[PDB]
Design a protein around this ligand. Structure first.
Ligand SMILES: *[C@@H]1O[C@H](CO)[C@@H](O)[C@H](O)[C@H]1NC(C)=O
Lengths: 50, 50, 44
Protein backbone atom coordinates (compact mmCIF):
# COMPACT_ATOMS: atom_id res chain seq x y z
CA UNK A 1 0.00 0.00 0.00
CA UNK A 2 0.94 3.66 0.12
CA UNK A 3 2.82 5.72 -2.44
CA UNK A 4 6.45 6.36 -3.32
CA UNK A 5 8.30 8.86 -1.14
CA UNK A 6 11.96 9.77 -0.57
CA UNK A 7 12.72 8.22 -3.95
CA UNK A 8 16.38 7.46 -4.63
CA UNK A 9 18.48 5.13 -6.75
CA UNK A 10 21.21 2.60 -6.07
CA UNK A 11 24.98 2.90 -6.36
CA UNK A 12 28.34 1.16 -6.37
CA UNK A 13 30.63 1.51 -3.36
CA UNK A 14 34.11 2.45 -4.55
CA UNK A 15 37.03 4.27 -2.95
CA UNK A 16 37.59 7.88 -3.96
CA UNK A 17 41.02 7.11 -5.46
CA UNK A 18 39.75 4.22 -7.59
CA UNK A 19 40.52 4.96 -11.27
CA UNK A 20 37.53 2.82 -12.31
CA UNK A 21 34.91 5.58 -11.98
CA UNK A 22 34.41 6.40 -15.66
CA UNK A 23 35.25 2.89 -16.87
CA UNK A 24 32.34 1.53 -14.81
CA UNK A 25 29.92 4.43 -15.31
CA UNK A 26 30.20 4.22 -19.11
CA UNK A 27 29.59 0.46 -19.04
CA UNK A 28 26.58 0.89 -16.75
CA UNK A 29 25.09 3.57 -19.01
CA UNK A 30 25.70 1.44 -22.11
CA UNK A 31 23.99 -1.55 -20.48
CA UNK A 32 21.08 0.66 -19.42
CA UNK A 33 20.65 2.14 -22.91
CA UNK A 34 21.08 -1.20 -24.73
CA UNK A 35 18.11 -2.84 -22.99
CA UNK A 36 20.06 -5.14 -20.67
CA UNK A 37 18.42 -3.63 -17.58
CA UNK A 38 14.86 -4.14 -18.83
CA UNK A 39 15.66 -7.71 -19.90
CA UNK A 40 17.08 -8.48 -16.45
CA UNK A 41 14.04 -6.88 -14.83
CA UNK A 42 11.70 -9.03 -16.93
CA UNK A 43 13.71 -12.23 -16.38
CA UNK A 44 14.34 -11.77 -12.63
CA UNK A 45 11.57 -9.62 -11.07
CA UNK A 46 8.45 -10.37 -13.15
CA UNK A 47 8.15 -14.15 -12.87
CA UNK A 48 4.47 -14.33 -11.87
CA UNK A 49 1.72 -12.01 -10.64
CA UNK A 50 -1.49 -12.27 -8.62
CA UNK B 1 29.20 -3.61 8.34
CA UNK B 2 29.78 -3.50 4.60
CA UNK B 3 30.64 0.21 4.57
CA UNK B 4 33.24 -0.28 7.29
CA UNK B 5 34.69 -3.30 5.49
CA UNK B 6 34.97 -1.22 2.31
CA UNK B 7 36.65 1.63 4.20
CA UNK B 8 39.08 -0.80 5.87
CA UNK B 9 40.47 -1.79 2.46
CA UNK B 10 39.24 -5.39 2.55
CA UNK B 11 36.94 -4.76 -0.43
CA UNK B 12 37.43 -2.56 -3.49
CA UNK B 13 34.17 -2.81 -5.47
CA UNK B 14 30.63 -3.54 -4.25
CA UNK B 15 27.85 -4.95 -6.43
CA UNK B 16 24.84 -5.10 -4.09
CA UNK B 17 21.59 -3.21 -3.47
CA UNK B 18 22.75 -0.08 -1.63
CA UNK B 19 20.68 3.09 -1.38
CA UNK B 20 22.64 6.27 -2.11
CA UNK B 21 22.64 8.68 0.83
CA UNK B 22 24.37 11.97 1.59
CA UNK B 23 26.24 10.62 4.63
CA UNK B 24 27.45 7.58 2.70
CA UNK B 25 28.52 9.74 -0.25
CA UNK B 26 30.46 12.10 2.04
CA UNK B 27 33.05 9.31 2.46
CA UNK B 28 32.44 6.78 -0.35
CA UNK B 29 31.75 7.92 -3.90
CA UNK B 30 28.97 6.19 -5.83
CA UNK B 31 28.13 5.67 -9.50
CA UNK B 32 24.99 6.17 -11.56
CA UNK B 33 22.01 4.22 -10.17
CA UNK B 34 20.80 1.12 -11.98
CA UNK B 35 17.11 1.82 -11.30
CA UNK B 36 14.95 4.32 -9.41
CA UNK B 37 12.80 2.79 -6.66
CA UNK B 38 11.68 4.40 -3.41
CA UNK B 39 10.36 2.93 -0.17
CA UNK B 40 6.79 1.79 0.47
CA UNK B 41 4.68 0.12 3.18
CA UNK B 42 4.05 -3.64 3.26
CA UNK B 43 0.99 -4.88 5.17
CA UNK B 44 -0.60 -8.33 5.17
CA UNK B 45 -4.16 -8.19 3.83
CA UNK B 46 -7.10 -10.05 5.34
CA UNK B 47 -9.83 -12.00 3.54
CA UNK B 48 -13.36 -10.87 4.52
CA UNK B 49 -15.64 -13.92 4.59
CA UNK B 50 -18.80 -13.11 6.58
CA UNK C 1 34.19 27.11 -22.36
CA UNK C 2 31.32 29.58 -22.77
CA UNK C 3 29.77 28.45 -19.46
CA UNK C 4 31.01 26.46 -16.47
CA UNK C 5 27.52 25.24 -15.49
CA UNK C 6 24.52 24.16 -17.57
CA UNK C 7 21.08 23.72 -16.01
CA UNK C 8 17.99 22.55 -17.85
CA UNK C 9 16.07 19.59 -19.22
CA UNK C 10 19.18 17.84 -20.52
CA UNK C 11 18.79 14.06 -20.75
CA UNK C 12 21.85 12.08 -19.67
CA UNK C 13 23.25 10.18 -22.66
CA UNK C 14 26.30 8.06 -23.41
CA UNK C 15 27.60 10.57 -25.97
CA UNK C 16 27.60 13.41 -23.43
CA UNK C 17 29.05 11.20 -20.68
CA UNK C 18 32.71 11.56 -21.73
CA UNK C 19 32.57 14.94 -23.48
CA UNK C 20 31.21 16.72 -20.39
CA UNK C 21 30.57 15.78 -16.76
CA UNK C 22 27.29 15.91 -14.85
CA UNK C 23 26.29 15.59 -11.21
CA UNK C 24 23.79 13.21 -9.60
CA UNK C 25 20.36 13.53 -11.27
CA UNK C 26 17.45 14.76 -9.17
CA UNK C 27 14.41 13.90 -11.33
CA UNK C 28 14.10 10.59 -13.18
CA UNK C 29 12.53 10.23 -16.63
CA UNK C 30 12.97 8.31 -19.86
CA UNK C 31 11.35 7.13 -23.07
CA UNK C 32 7.55 6.96 -23.04
CA UNK C 33 4.73 6.59 -25.58
CA UNK C 34 1.75 8.95 -25.66
CA UNK C 35 -1.49 7.76 -27.26
CA UNK C 36 -5.13 8.78 -26.96
CA UNK C 37 -7.26 6.49 -24.81
CA UNK C 38 -9.75 4.32 -26.71
CA UNK C 39 -13.34 3.88 -25.58
CA UNK C 40 -14.06 0.58 -23.85
CA UNK C 41 -24.50 -12.04 -17.09
CA UNK C 42 -23.28 -12.67 -13.52
CA UNK C 43 -20.40 -14.73 -14.97
CA UNK C 44 -17.25 -13.34 -13.27
C1 LIG D 1 39.04 3.11 -19.36
O1 LIG D 1 38.67 3.26 -20.74
C2 LIG D 1 39.65 3.95 -21.52
C3 LIG D 1 39.07 4.11 -22.91
O2 LIG D 1 37.88 3.35 -23.06
C4 LIG D 1 40.97 3.17 -21.52
O3 LIG D 1 41.95 3.90 -22.24
C5 LIG D 1 41.44 2.94 -20.09
O4 LIG D 1 42.59 2.11 -20.08
C6 LIG D 1 40.33 2.29 -19.26
N1 LIG D 1 40.75 2.14 -17.88
C7 LIG D 1 41.30 1.02 -17.40
C8 LIG D 1 41.67 1.04 -15.95
O5 LIG D 1 41.48 0.03 -18.10
Amino acid sequence: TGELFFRSGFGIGMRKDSPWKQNVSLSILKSHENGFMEDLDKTWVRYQEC
Amino acid sequence: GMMGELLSGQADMIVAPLTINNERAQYIEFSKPFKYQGLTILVKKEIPRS
Amino acid sequence: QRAVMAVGSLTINEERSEVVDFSVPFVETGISVMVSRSNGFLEP
